[PDB]
Amino acid sequence: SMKISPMLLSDIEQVVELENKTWSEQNTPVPLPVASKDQIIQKFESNTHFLVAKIKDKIVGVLDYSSLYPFPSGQHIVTFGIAVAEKERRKGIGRALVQIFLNEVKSDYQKVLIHVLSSNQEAVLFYKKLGFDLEARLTKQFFLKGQYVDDLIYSYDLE
Numbered sequence: 001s002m003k004i005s006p007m008l009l010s011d012i013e014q015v016v017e018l019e020n021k022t023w024s025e026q027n028t029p030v031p032l033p034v035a036s037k038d039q040i041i042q043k044f045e046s047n048t049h050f051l052v053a054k055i056k057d058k059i060v061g062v063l064d065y066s067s068l069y070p071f072p073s074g075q076h077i078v079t080f081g082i083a084v085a086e087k088e089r090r091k092g093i094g095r096a097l098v099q100i101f102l103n104e105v106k107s108d109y110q111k112v113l114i115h116v117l118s119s120n121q122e123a124v125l126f127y128k129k130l131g132f133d134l135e136a137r138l139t140k141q142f143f144l145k146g147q148y149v150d151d152l153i154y155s156y157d158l159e
């Protein structure tokens, strides 16, 4: 059975491995690899929070979130990343992560906002399905694999 829980310091090896199997030029414009033990600790030590999903105390999903801006005028906007293990997808894990996340931040923020590469077909469908709004589209933001990719900006009304 599947459980969601706070990420442990001792879980970081696994989160690194999972993320680095997950990120491709299809879903991020940053150079690869994006994850490392020390990058993840840096984040952990600067207030980014991590939800993790396990199946037999094996990590199969991860969601990190944090304030979008470090200054007060923008402090009411939260952002997040999420990665589900390829073999474990389409089983409700993403949904369940997003759902507890939303209930964490409900109280403390007004608005969720994320950036999605237009090449990220499953993310596009995922976010629409979970009720996010397509707020903006930035045209030809990135060149990846000989294609011009757009940046789709999705938001969520915490209210």
Ligand SMILES: CC(C)(COP(=O)(O)OP(=O)(O)OC[C@H]1O[C@@H](n2cnc3c(N)ncnc32)[C@H](O)[C@H]1OP(=O)(O)O)[C@@H](O)C(=O)NCCC(=O)NCCS
Pocket: 022, 023, 027, 081, 082, 083, 084, 085, 088, 089, 090, 091, 092, 093, 094, 095, 096, 120, 121, 122, 123, 125, 126, 129
């Ligand atoms: C996007 C992602 C997190 C969704 O993970 P998930 O656990 O497989 O999603 P869920 O099982 O919770 O599904 C909720 C839903 O997502 C949709 N969706 C997710 N993947 C889809 C796909 N490959 N094709 C069509 N619809 C899809 C649904 O249609 C939906 O409802 P349903 O499953 O009852 O049909 C997963 O694909 C992911 O890991 N992508 C890898 C890289 C990434 O993270 N992209 C951007 C996030 S920063």
